[PDB]
Enzyme design. Structure first.
Site, PDB file in Angstrom:
ATOM      1  N   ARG A 341       0.807  -1.219   0.000  1.00 41.63           N
ATOM      2  CA  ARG A 341       0.000   0.000   0.000  1.00 41.63           C
ATOM      3  C   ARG A 341       0.842   1.272   0.000  1.00 41.63           C
ATOM      4  O   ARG A 341       0.357   2.316  -0.448  1.00 41.63           O
ATOM      5  CB  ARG A 341      -0.958   0.008   1.198  1.00 41.63           C
ATOM      6  N   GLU A 374      -2.619  -7.747   3.693  1.00 43.22           N
ATOM      7  CA  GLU A 374      -4.061  -7.932   3.732  1.00 43.22           C
ATOM      8  C   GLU A 374      -4.437  -9.308   3.203  1.00 43.22           C
ATOM      9  O   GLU A 374      -3.662  -9.963   2.500  1.00 43.22           O
ATOM     10  CB  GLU A 374      -4.763  -6.837   2.927  1.00 43.22           C
ATOM     11  N   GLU A 385     -10.392  -1.772  -5.938  1.00 43.31           N
ATOM     12  CA  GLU A 385      -9.696  -0.907  -4.999  1.00 43.31           C
ATOM     13  C   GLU A 385      -8.293  -0.578  -5.494  1.00 43.31           C
ATOM     14  O   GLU A 385      -7.841   0.573  -5.403  1.00 43.31           O
ATOM     15  CB  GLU A 385      -9.657  -1.586  -3.633  1.00 43.31           C
ATOM     16  N   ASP A 442     -12.206   5.835 -12.856  1.00 40.89           N
ATOM     17  CA  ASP A 442     -12.594   7.245 -12.823  1.00 40.89           C
ATOM     18  C   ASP A 442     -11.544   8.140 -13.484  1.00 40.89           C
ATOM     19  O   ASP A 442     -11.076   9.111 -12.897  1.00 40.89           O
ATOM     20  CB  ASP A 442     -12.918   7.685 -11.395  1.00 40.89           C
ATOM     21  N   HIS A 653     -19.766   0.818   1.193  1.00 42.76           N
ATOM     22  CA  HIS A 653     -18.575   0.050   0.821  1.00 42.76           C
ATOM     23  C   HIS A 653     -18.484   0.077  -0.710  1.00 42.76           C
ATOM     24  O   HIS A 653     -19.067  -0.766  -1.398  1.00 42.76           O
ATOM     25  CB  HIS A 653     -18.628  -1.392   1.399  1.00 42.76           C
ATOM     26  N   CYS A 655     -16.216  -0.676  -2.782  1.00 40.29           N
ATOM     27  CA  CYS A 655     -15.559  -1.792  -3.459  1.00 40.29           C
ATOM     28  C   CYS A 655     -16.530  -2.910  -3.833  1.00 40.29           C
ATOM     29  O   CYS A 655     -16.224  -3.702  -4.733  1.00 40.29           O
ATOM     30  CB  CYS A 655     -14.439  -2.329  -2.564  1.00 40.29           C
TER      31      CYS A 655
END
Ligand SMILES: [Zn+2]
Ligand SMILES: [Zn+2]
Lengths: 681, 142
Positions: A341, A374, A385, A442, A653, A655
């Site tokens: 991340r 994760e 995500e 996006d 949420h 995602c």
């Protein structure tokens, strides 16, 4: 007064006599005995205006209309035989006259013709040899827009009529109907007339097709064959594009918008898995609508492309297995990305580049993302995500790769970027992977970008979106009628801002500061300045970006099925927001049901929202204010109960598109809390 | 030596004479496994109209197992579309007799007799990476 061929004057001989004898049966005898014969017609004239006058006079009498109809029904089935078995056109190139004569009849689109006469005529026409079609299309491309519209409408009504009149199902395919297939082939003929009749720019806008070199194995097989320098062969090209010499991508502006060729009823009935099969495997008895891409809407096309992507992913999986069986080597069937991340861009680059360099075929595997630290199974939510993070990081002004326009809310390549060509390649690959995995991003690029991706350089007219402040200024400069040299004092030198805000002077032409812009050279200056801003200023970065994109899409039918305007839709999703379709497909969890009072009140509120509130609601629930390819009905939104009535705002949420909605005690409270959530998020 | 990239013989018969040797005398390695070909395979390599691959001036051929393997992989990877011979003739504006088509399983060029068989049995020809392939008699019978 029998005669073997007919002319305007010959017709007038009877107009007068029939009126004088208060009869029409002799003229009907004549017209029938004429128009039932292909030879009579072929020999009768090219005299377009005469035909137009004749029709304008004859179709004024109802009795004669039925005679035309009845003659055409007799004519066409024989013409089909001539073209299919006797190759008549190869003996007499005037045979095409027949079809020209018939098509000038204005009444072909009335229902009487649609039921039988026009279908038969379509069956005949759709058998013309390519050279003849090319001759005809070139003629139609000179017609007025309303006439193209009429011809388009003439076949559109037929395709619509037959789709509506016949019951199609998984055992009775639209692909098996000769009438619709014939009509579609005719409509294709019109479509290319529309293309060729539009504005076409072929001499100043072509970019080279850059192909990624295949893996060493395929290279060795290509070397073992005589193909060391024959790496460039192009996708499946349409025969008509070859005969006409003009591609769908070459027309800058058609006479009638390409969207009007989309037949929505047909699209609602067409089964794409089977069509794609017929597209891939030619069968003598079945047609494929993918060979007629203009008629399919973006949803239907995307579903075809998705079948292509999935069939390839599955092929790569088979290859993986075969390699493991014969050589014992264990390769991953997925494009498994593992990233941290705190280093998403670097980890993604190194991994995708090692993959592209070691095996450029791996980029065609199914994407699967794992964030280091994760734990979860990537059912698409982790990938979505990942895309959000990557896109946000890449467009941050601190990275300097892109400049953001406050006016249009669009991003454009930073000419002054020192960043390596790697990052540009990465963003290119990401776009490819998004199409390949049907995930909306996006991203906000002006139309020029999608044109450049397809291999067309951006032209002056494309500045209308990317640089309005610039496009307007250049348009003003072109529209000015005074001495440009004395009145504007501009030279072939321009100023560009460096990352540090310094104005860098760039010469569009050698020692450009000493070369003044004159009225005779201003159009050239605009072409050069446009070429600088759209190409030569970013070419270093853009070339890398484009390479990245092609590494994923090089073998895709994308270049054949879609256009720049449709690429945007695949990547970013649609701007049309149908909330009725969203209601129909929304799922409920936590004890809500479609019959719950709060849910009915929720839909009353959401239907009463403004388009801006609706965009905000989607942004809040889904992470994007646009609808996926096919509208909001494709978005599996889940309304999940988040406890009883409380003062809390709803939560989301993005995602997984889940809306966590409390069971509020009143419609007004639901409306106020929902409005506040979507406004303050 | 064949260390000149451009001026080294391409087809095995040429390499025989270039090394002043015959097909009955020459020994060659397969480009993937570098194993030695059986003489039967050497003959077939000549019959299959394939090109010698050169690394550092050394010639390499391809044995039967490797050729079939990599061809089958290439089929699975770059398959494009399948047409009937008749349709194919119209797309290329030439009779099938004249068009270059190789065996999809073993690369051997297809004879006009085999091409005719494809038309007789209404079988399609496959475009792979932009080159056309069919199935020779020794691969449609197995
Ligand atoms: Zn070998
Ligand atoms: Zn074979």
């Amino acid at each position: 007064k029998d005669v073997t061929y007919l002319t305007e004057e010959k017709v007038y001989e009877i107009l007068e006599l029939c009126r004088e004898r208060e009869d029409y049966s002799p003229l009907i005898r004549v017209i029938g005995r004429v128009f039932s014969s292909a030879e009579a017609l072929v020999q009768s004239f090219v005299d377009i205006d005469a035909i137009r006058r004749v029709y304008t006079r004859l179709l004024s009498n109802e009795k004669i209309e039925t005679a035309f109809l009845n003659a055409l029904v007799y004519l066409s089935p024989n013409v089909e035989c001539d073209l299919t078995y006797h190759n008549v056109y190869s003996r007499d190139p005037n045979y095409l006259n027949l079809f020209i004569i018939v098509m000038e009849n204005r009444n072909l689109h009335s229902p009487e013709y649609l039921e039988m006469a026009l279908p038969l005529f379509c069956k005949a026409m759709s058998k013309l040899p390519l050279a003849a079609q090319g001759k005809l299309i070139r003629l139609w491309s000179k017609y007025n827009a309303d006439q193209i519209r009429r011809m388009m409408e003439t076949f559109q009504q037929l395709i619509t009529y037959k789709v509506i009149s016949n019951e199609f199902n998984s055992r009775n395919l639209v692909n098996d109907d000769d009438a619709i297939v014939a009509a579609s082939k005719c409509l294709k003929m019109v479509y290319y007339a529309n293309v060729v009749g539009g504005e076409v720019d072929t001499n100043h806008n072509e970019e080279d097709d850059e192909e990624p070199i295949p893996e060493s194995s395929e290279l060795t097989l290509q070397e073992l064959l005589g193909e060391e320098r024959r790496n460039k062969k192009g996708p499946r090209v349409d025969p008509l594009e070859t005969e006409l010499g003009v591609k769908t991508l070459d027309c800058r502006k058609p006479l009638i918008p390409f969207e009007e060729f989309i037949n929505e009823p047909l699209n609602e009935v067409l089964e794409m898995d089977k069509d794609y099969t017929f597209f891939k495997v030619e069968t003598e008895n079945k047609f494929s609508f993918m060979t007629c891409p203009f008629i399919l809407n973006a949803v239907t096309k995307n579903l075809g492309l998705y079948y292509d992507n999935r069939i390839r992913m599955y092929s790569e999986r088979r290859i993986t297995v075969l390699y493991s069986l014969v050589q014992g080597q264990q390769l991953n069937p997925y494009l498994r990305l593992k990233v941290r991340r705190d280093h998403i861009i670097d980890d993604a680059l190194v991994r995708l580049e090692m993959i592209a360099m070691e095996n450029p075929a791996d980029l065609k595997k199914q994407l699967y993302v794992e964030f280091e630290g994760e734990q979860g199974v990537d059912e698409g939510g982790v990938s979505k995500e990942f895309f959000q993070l990557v896109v946000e990081e890449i467009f941050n002004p601190d990275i300097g790769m892109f400049t953001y326009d406050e006016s249009t809310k669009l991003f454009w390549f930073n000419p002054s970027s020192f960043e390596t060509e790697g990052q540009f390649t990465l963003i290119g690959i990401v776009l490819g992977l998004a199409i390949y995995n049907n995930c909306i991003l996006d991203v906000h690029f002006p139309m020029v970008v999608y044109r450049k991706l397809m291999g067309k350089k951006g032209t002056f007219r494309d500045l209308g979106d990317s640089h309005p402040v610039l496009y307007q200024s250049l348009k003003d400069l072109l529209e000015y009628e005074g001495n440009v040299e004395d009145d504007m004092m501009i030279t072939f030198q321009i100023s560009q801002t460096d990352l540090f805000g310094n104005p860098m002077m760039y010469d569009l032409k050698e020692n450009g500061d000493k070369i003044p812009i004159t009225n005779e050279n201003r159009k050239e200056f605009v072409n050069l300045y446009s070429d600088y801003i759209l190409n030569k200023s970013v070419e270093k970065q853009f070339k890398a970006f484009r390479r990245g994109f092609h590494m994923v899409t090089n073998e895709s039918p994308l270049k054949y099925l879609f256009r720049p305007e449709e690429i945007e839709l695949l990547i970013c999703g649609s701007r049309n927001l149908d909330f009725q379709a969203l209601e129909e497909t929304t799922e409920y969890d936590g004890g809500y049901t479609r019959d719950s009072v709060l849910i009915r009140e929720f839909w009353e509120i959401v239907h009463s929202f403004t388009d801006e509130q609706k965009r905000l609601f989607l942004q809040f629930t889904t992470g994007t204010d646009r609808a996926p390819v096919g509208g909001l009905g494709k978005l599996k939104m889940i309304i999940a109960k988040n406890g009883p009535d409380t003062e809390r705002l709803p939560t989301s949420h993005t995602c997984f598109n889940v809306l966590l909605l409390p069971e509020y005690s009143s419609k007004e409270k639901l409306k106020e809390r929902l409005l506040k959530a979507i406004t303050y998020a | 030596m064949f260390q000149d990239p451009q001026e080294r013989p391409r087809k095995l018969p040429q390499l025989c004479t270039e090394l002043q040797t015959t097909i009955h005398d020459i020994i060659l390695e397969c480009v993937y496994c570098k194993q030695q070909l059986l003489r039967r395979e050497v003959y077939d390599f000549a019959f299959r109209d394939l090109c010698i691959v050169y690394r550092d001036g050394n010639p390499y051929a391809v044995c039967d197992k490797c050729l079939k393997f990599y061809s089958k992989i290439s089929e699975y990877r770059h398959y494009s579309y399948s047409l009937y011979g008749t349709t194919l003739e119209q797309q290329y504006n030439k009779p099938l007799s004249d068009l270059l088509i190789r065996c999809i399983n073993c690369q051997k060029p297809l004879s006009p007799e085999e091409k005719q068989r494809h038309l007789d049995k209404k079988q399609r020809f496959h475009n792979i990476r932009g080159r056309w392939t069919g199935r020779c008699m020794s691969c449609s019978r197995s």
